[PDB]
């Protein structure tokens, strides 16, 4: 009967090991109190974040560690009841593993409208890879490789129709299936360019 709050992370929900992040819950203007939770990996109960650590629905993490990663949700209290939990915020830590290599075939320079193959490679196998694109006009879109039986050290993605106007800068990350919110250092940025 009371609208569920939202939950966000500042500056981002993808944060390098040791760096700070703040999670913010915001409910109705008449919220009297907030609670924050994180979902347990392989336990049916969830973790209450200690109330001494949530001030005005804010939970500040001075240096993120692997133990902070996972799904968070929050509620607030108003009109004698607690709200349902927010939509989950997934907090991710990067930099736990050496970065993979990212390359384009046939070329990082691609005619407008053409498609291209990107390859993410690693010296040691990962459970899976993700290829993320960020541009001036859109949110991060990550393609996911299909996880394989005993992990893999190479993944192949197809990207584009590339267009001139957009910016097509990609990075790729490796992760292990049993802790999927702990990622490698990102690969070097690979920018696809269109001659025109
Ligand atoms: Cl850590
Ligand atoms: Cl693949």
Q: What is the CATH number of the domain that holds 39?
A: 2.60.40.10
Contact at 8 Å (CB) between 133 and 158?
Answer: no
Say whether both 101 and 68 belong to one domain: no
For this PDB entry, the determination method is X-ray
What CA–CA distance (Å, rounded) separates 139 from 53? 30
Ligand nearest to the CA of 126: 2
- Residues 107 and 85 occupy one common structural domain: no
Token pair recorded at residue 99: 């970065």
Both 126 and 88 in one domain: the answer is no
* Same-domain pairing of 47 and 115: no
Examine the fold and report which residue of 65, 94, 123 is the final residue of a domain before the chain moves on: 94
What's the 144 CA to ligand 2 centre distance in angstroms?
9
Domain residue limits at 77: 1-94
CA atoms within 13 A on the CB side of 28: 15
Peptide bond into 161 cis (omega under 30): yes
The residues near 80 (Cβ < 8 Å, ≥ 6 apart) are none
Ligand nearest to the CA of 145: 2
- 8 within 8 A of 36, measured Cβ to Cβ: no
Looking at 77, 94, 111, the residue that finishes a domain is: 94
* Whether residue 191 is found in the same domain as residue 144: yes
79 and 133: one domain?
no
* Claim to verify: residue 61 and residue 108 sit in the same structural domain: no
Number of domains present in the structure of the chain: 2
Whether residues 187 and 101 share a domain: the answer is: yes
In DSSP notation, the chain reads -----EEEEES-SEEETT--EEEEEE--TT--EEEEEEE-TT-SSEEEPPGGGEETTEEEESS--GGG-EEEEEEEEETTEEPPPPSPEEEEEE-SSPPPEEEEES-SB--TT--EEEEEEEEEEESEEEEEEE-SSS--EEEEPPP-TT-EEEEEEEE----SSS-EEEEEEEEETTEEEEEPPPPPPEEEB---
- CB proximity list for 150: less than 8 A, separation 6 or greater: 125
CA 139 to ligand 1 center in whole angstroms: 27
Resolution of the solved structure (Å): 2.1
Place of tokens 């702990």: 182
Domain boundary among 64, 94, 124: 94
Residue 36 shares a structural domain with residue 70: yes
Q: What is the distance in A from the centroid of ligand 1 to the CA of 68?
A: 9
Assess whether 187 and 114 both reside in one domain.
Answer: yes
């Amino acid at each position: 009967t009371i609208p569920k709050p939202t939950l966000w992370a500042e500056p981002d929900s993808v944060i390098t090991q040791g760096s700070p992040v703040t999670l913010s819950c915001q409910g109705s203007l008449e919220a009297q109190e907030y609670r924050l939770y994180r979902e347990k990996k392989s336990a049916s109960w969830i973790t209450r974040i200690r109330p001494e650590l949530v001030k005005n629905g804010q939970f500040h993490i001075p240096s993120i560690t692997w133990e902070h990663t996972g799904r968070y949700g929050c509620q607030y209290y108003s009109r004698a009841r607690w709200s349902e939990l927010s939509d989950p915020l997934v907090l991710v830590m990067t930099g736990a593993y050496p970065k993979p290599t990212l390359s384009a075939q046939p070329s990082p320079v691609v005619t407008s409208g053409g498609r291209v193959t990107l390859q993410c490679e690693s010296q040691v196998a990962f459970g899976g890879f993700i290829l993320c694109k960020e541009g001036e006009d859109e949110h991060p879109q990550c393609l996911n490789s299909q996880p394989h039986a005993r992990g893999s050290s190479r993944a192949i993605f197809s990207v584009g129709p590339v267009s001139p106007n957009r910016r097509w800068s990609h990075r790729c990350y490796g992760y292990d299936l049993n802790s999927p919110y702990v990622w490698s250092s990102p690969s070097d940025l690979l920018e696809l360019l269109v001659p025109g």
